[PDB]
């Protein structure tokens, strides 16, 4: 039983409902080839200069990812295609709003570009958020998902190069006795395609068996504004922040946030007013 494939043009309303039911879905043409081209162009350097996840020069090292992994967050100042294009995506926001309406506003927990080197071993099956948000394990089982992950293929995802393994229906599992690699299906995709999984879906990156292929992805974690992001955008230049849209500014934490409570008092407010009003932050300016 393979992962459902969907359209970013025709079947838009069916995407969240699918993930909801299966835990995963592939969105073909999630990003256009032109956008994926510029994204790669722009992040290429940073991917090569990034050190090991657990580098010694880091005060917040990551001991979970492997040495063959390279990750780059805080992509707003690096890429114009991310901050203008991806962040304002109508396919993304439709899915996000459909998924997180019960809770309210959402934002970006992380937007990272990940490049796996050749001979990169498979990861162990895991659920996201368990190394940053321990509170996600104390949620009831029927609680609607608090975060969803968009893994966008920046290059081909194949069986030889390590295409993601997913266990379907695993987001509705409490008992992890059936966790095994045999129960998984693959996510084959071309550049621009996106696998969409929730925070409770058991998945993993596969093994790179060729020795020559480099696999790259753009991973965007979206979550409710009630949870703290993994990455901070506090040091992003104001000129860059002021060149964004309001929606892009609020996704990055440069805005106040609301919740779905009927008489919501807000998040990140300053004596009744917004972050944006208080600092008189403009939008859509040039850089």
Residues that bind ligand CV3 (CB under 6 A): 62, 64-66, 71, 110, 112, 114, 123-124, 126, 128-131, 219, 221
Stretch 107-136 residues interacting with Fe ion (CB under 5 A): 128
CB of 287 to Fe ion, least distance (A): 33
Count interface residues toward Fe ion (CB under 5 A): 1
Q: Whose CA is closest to 212, among 116, 125, 141, 137?
A: 116
CB of 238 to ligand CV3, least distance (A): 27
57 contact partners, CB below 8 Å, separation of at least 6:
51
CB of 46 to ligand CV3, least distance (A): 15
DSSP single-letter state for residue 11: -
Burial class (CB in 10 A: 0-12, 13-18, 19+), 176: exposed
Residues belonging to the binding site for Fe cation are: 126, 128, 203
Query: Which residue minimizes CB distance to Fe ion?
Result: 128
Distance CA 39, CA 207 (A): 25
H or E element at residue 33: helix 33-49
Residue nearer to ligand CV3 on the CB measure, 202 or 281? 202
Residue nearer to ligand CV3 on the CB measure, 7 or 66? 66
Q: Which does 62 bind (CB under 5 to 8 A by kind): Fe ion, ligand CV3, none?
A: ligand CV3
Burial class (CB in 10 A: 0-12, 13-18, 19+), 38: middle
CB of 197 to Fe ion, least distance (A): 8
Q: How far apart are the first and last CA of the chain?
A: 48
Q: Which residues bind Fe ion (CB under 5 A)?
A: 128
């Amino acid at each position: 039983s393979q992962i459902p494939r969907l359209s970013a043009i025709n079947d838009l309303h069916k995407i969240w409902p699918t993930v909801e039911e299966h835990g995963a879905a592939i969105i073909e043409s999630f990003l256009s080839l032109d956008i994926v081209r510029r994204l790669n162009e722009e992040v290429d350097p940073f991917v090569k200069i990034e050190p090991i996840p657990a580098a010694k020069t880091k005060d917040h090292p990551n001991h979970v990812l492997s040495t063959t992994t390279r990750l780059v967050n805080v992509l707003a100042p690096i890429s114009k295609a991310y901050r203008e294009d991806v962040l304002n995506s109508k396919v993304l926001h439709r899915i996000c709003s459909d998924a997180f309406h019960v809770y309210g506003d959402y934002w970006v927990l992380m937007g990272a570009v990940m490049e796996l080197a050749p001979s990169n071993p498979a990861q162990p099956l895991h659920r996201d958020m368990r190394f940053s948000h321990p509170i996600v394990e104390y949620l009831k089982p029927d609680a609607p998902a608090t975060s969803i992950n968009f893994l966008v293929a920046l290059s081909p995802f194949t069986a030889e190069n390590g295409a993601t393994h997913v266990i379907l229906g695993s987001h509705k599992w409490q008992n992890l006795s059936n966790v095994s690699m045999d129960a998984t299906v693959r996510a084959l995709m071309n550049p621009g395609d996106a696998l969409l999984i929730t925070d409770s879906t058991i998945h993993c990156g596969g093994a790179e068996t060729t020795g020559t292929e480099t696999r790259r992805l753009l991973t965007i974690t979206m979550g409710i504004s009630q949870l703290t992001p993994l990455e901070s955008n506090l040091a992003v230049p104001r000129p860059v922040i002021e060149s964004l849209t309001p929606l892009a500014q609020r996704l990055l934490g440069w805005a106040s946030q609301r919740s779905a409570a009927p008489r919501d008092i807000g998040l990140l407010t300053i004596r009744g007013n917004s972050i944006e009003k208080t600092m008189n932050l403009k939008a859509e300016q040039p850089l």
